[PDB]
Design a protein around this ligand. Structure first.
Ligand SMILES: Cc1cc(-c2ccc(S(N)(=O)=O)s2)cnc1-c1cccc2ncccc12
Ligand SMILES: Cc1cc(-c2ccc(S(N)(=O)=O)s2)cnc1-c1cccc2ncccc12
Ligand SMILES: Cc1cc(-c2ccc(S(N)(=O)=O)s2)cnc1-c1cccc2ncccc12
Ligand SMILES: Cc1cc(-c2ccc(S(N)(=O)=O)s2)cnc1-c1cccc2ncccc12
Ligand SMILES: [Zn+2]
Ligand SMILES: [Zn+2]
Ligand SMILES: [Zn+2]
Ligand SMILES: [Zn+2]
Lengths: 260, 260, 260, 260
């Protein structure tokens, strides 16, 4: 058991999850002093992201985020190995302070953040295996700010009232996950990091796109208010808000950019 | 044993010091969504801050920071109690990333941060018994930015190369401590928080001045490069750099401002 | 009554020493699939390793290796028990194939290997008693590759031409044993294993440092050609070469690393 | 009784099978220091390897491997004597660590290894007579790696669910065995060695082909998960995994290559 608030909150993760107090922890603040252009970074190519409408995909409240399962025939090209998709999920703040991205840029929090998790499907049979091993995972991160209505993000958010509580589940018809990504995917930040939640394994290769996406005022408030961390009858219900980790120390180490 | 790096670093403080994973932790990011103007916040008066030039004051490398002992006849006027000074010390980054303040403003790290530590002398007989009790401590924070040489700060910094190693001490002739304070001390952020180092006692009334002071690049580099956490003859020395805590979650609370 | 070649070689050790065909045998091949990061592995401290230069320490050819006796005031700090030093020795190949390390990394042999042997002095009165008992021993392993001359190793290797035959003894003045260790001793592999020689007791907590040291081409050749397994007057001399065990099966088990 | 794990495992083979602790043991690591080009080595020709589809060949789980019986009208030309076939079988690792070849190349384990066993039909009347006599046996070894699906190897793998336990047998229709061999069979390593299982007779002339073949992830996982070392009625079942011998010392001896 771990939470984002109170006694089992993130300063206490290291007790049961020692890696949370270990190496290569994420997320981080992306600022000029630790950036470095790498001319050899190539654009990712996104394959099998256009999910068939006649198929459906499981959405789950896992008590920490809302999660959509993704098929292993969905994959990224442009890394050392083929990585196949396993799931995506989100991180957000709260109505009084709607800044709940994990990564920050020059000290600025965005409204929210999308993570699309992949496992090394050349080396490893499944995400389970891959999660605590070298070269294990590749996570794509999209920064989300307030703006115009996003019909693509609403393909997820229109389902939130069916996964209000921990353990609940709902099917979503296939849509084009590539619509979730920003402008000019070629431009990104890349560094070696970790899971941002327990167990905090340092097995993730991070790609954070430079350019944010927009969702409406209304869409963001919906996401911040829809969900609970607790089961259909915990005596003490807890709202799912502020489900992001504080940025970590990042000392004598480098984040590589595909832009100058 | 605690540090700012490695297995004894801040994510693991909670394992030896339970308060570091509890409530009311410092430091924090000061941003609009959690600020509120409070016109009842009156100017502090700084009494006995003009230390006798004929007296000397102990400077010490304690392995975590550099610390100057302060006399009990030094005190803050204008709080519910009189608070008497006990010591001051600093926090800083590193030459490759010179942004090591503890508190941030709108996401932005300053170069360094000065802390003038006081205890409630009305209620308690010394800082020791005040430290972990209600209304025990008040800390004044000055944010420090790189720019102009600062003669007053140099009355401390000129002694740095003579306390390079843990346990070493020097004497500092009395000078006017009020000269370390920024302009318009009437303007400040106020909130209830904690020590930013173990034991992380949540017993601190924080006053962070609105306006930064400046020190020279040269002053900053001396601060960032002169000092070691280790004793003189340790075969493997460790540099005293990045001795600041990351900002903490601050939800469902307000910081009060004396300026609008 | 055992060798590293022919009928009394390692496939036959189990006929004379039951533990050599038992569980938890060393050495092993260190490869990604059986590695796991463990943030709980903190740095050892090497205490009393700076041996008095006014003292001398017995170096012996015992017919299997060259051995340096070590004082019991020398010890490892940072394990559950104190482990006190008893001897160090080496393992090597031969000039025709100079890859005689015991542990391998991703299949690759290094030139040679140093073992520094310690016993659990909290639990047990001497190394003799600890040798075949629970948590009895702890061995530090340094992988040795051929490269730059090493003055510290030469404090040993300079005496080799005076212990050429079995039973012969020389005195080595005290020097700093820490100088035999590599860079970044905080980085290591840890696993539960056995003596690599008869009687092969499965009582050893192994720490293999991640990073090798270098010794010169000339130092390596002296190690591989100076010593004999036989007594001086024996008309049939056998050269002390290839005195390393092959790697053992390692299944249903993990090696824990302090690095990722 | 002998096994690849625990107290009857490979370090104990010598107790009842003396030759396992003897001369000329296999397998070995093939690395530059012990290789020598030999221009007189000629290519093998493979005769009667295209087995009639109208005949049947017995597949058996023998408790140590899966074996396919072969006819003696299958032979190799290109050695000193005609060698005629008796069986083929395989060696493999386990799902967590899918590296179970017997021979290694520059320290690298491949996924698995195929052995095609032949006996000297010029000198001896049958494989049994030949097995423990001078010039008795010749074994071809093919190294196997993860890659594309291999429909030729599936002519074996598709019958595995019929031989899950020791003693169980199934007939396989003839296919072309030459389909199991890699590209450029003319390039190979040759050396004098032994059976890699008890009784470890030193009577094998080994040919290991330079180039590996590929099978899919699913085929390799199939092979590693299908079979048991124990009978139908064993109360203590054991999965058939890691059925490969560790590499042997190879001192004062040469492997000859057909390529330079
Ligand atoms: C692949 C995976 C990612 C995650 C993630 C946690 C946090 C992230 S995030 N915030 O993108 O860094 S991804 C959690 N669990 C698994 C996972 C998936 C499937 C089986 C697992 N078995 C053991 C441990 C973890 C397993
Ligand atoms: C009051 C006090 C605060 C602190 C502080 C640690 C960190 C801060 S900071 N970073 O301003 O929050 S203040 C350290 N020592 C004492 C202190 C001062 C004097 C005597 C003490 N005796 C026992 C324990 C602590 C004593
Ligand atoms: C504790 C010990 C380990 C060893 C070792 C044999 C092999 C290793 S190695 N290759 O590090 O695994 S360490 C040798 N001698 C002693 C030892 C040391 C001192 C007294 C002894 N008395 C009886 C038996 C052994 C004694
Ligand atoms: C059973 C057997 C195994 C082997 C082999 C055992 C291991 C290998 S391998 N792993 O290719 O080196 S080949 C060779 N010939 C025979 C053989 C085959 C047929 C009859 C026999 N009679 C007596 C002894 C051996 C006989
Ligand atoms: Zn995430
Ligand atoms: Zn402070
Ligand atoms: Zn040894
Ligand atoms: Zn075989």
């Amino acid at each position: 058991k771990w939470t984002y608030f109170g006694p089992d909150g993130e300063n206490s993760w290291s007790k049961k999850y020692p890696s949370c107090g270990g190496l290569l922890q994420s997320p981080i603040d992306l600022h000029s002093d630790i950036l470095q252009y790498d001319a050899s970074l190539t654009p990712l190519e996104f394959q099998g992201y256009n999910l068939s409408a006649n198929k459906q995909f499981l959405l789950t409240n896992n008590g920490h985020s809302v999660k959509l399962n993704l098929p292993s025939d969905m994959h990224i090209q442009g890394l050392q190995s083929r990585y196949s998709a396993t799931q995506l999920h989100l991180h957000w703040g709260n109505p009084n302070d709607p800044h709940g991205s994990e990564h920050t840029v020059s000290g600025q929090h965005f409204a929210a953040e999308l993570h699309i998790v992949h496992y090394n499907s050349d080396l490893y049979p499944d995400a389970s295996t891959a999660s605590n091993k070298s070269e294990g995972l590749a996570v794509l991160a999209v920064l989300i700010e307030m703006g115009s209505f996003n019909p693509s993000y609403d393909k997820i958010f229109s389902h939130l009232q069916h996964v209000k509580y921990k353990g609940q589940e709902a099917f979503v018809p296939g849509f084009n996950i590539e619509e979730l990504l920003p402008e000019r995917t070629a431009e990104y930040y890349r560094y070696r990091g970790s899971l941002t939640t327990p167990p905090c394994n340092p097995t993730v290769l991070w790609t954070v796109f430079r350019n944010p996406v927009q969702i409406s005022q209304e869409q963001l408030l919906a996401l911040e208010t829809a969900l609970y961390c607790t089961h259909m009858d915990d005596p003490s219900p807890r709202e799912m808000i502020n489900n992001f980790r504080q940025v970590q120390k990042f000392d004598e180490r480098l984040v590589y950019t595909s832009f100058s």
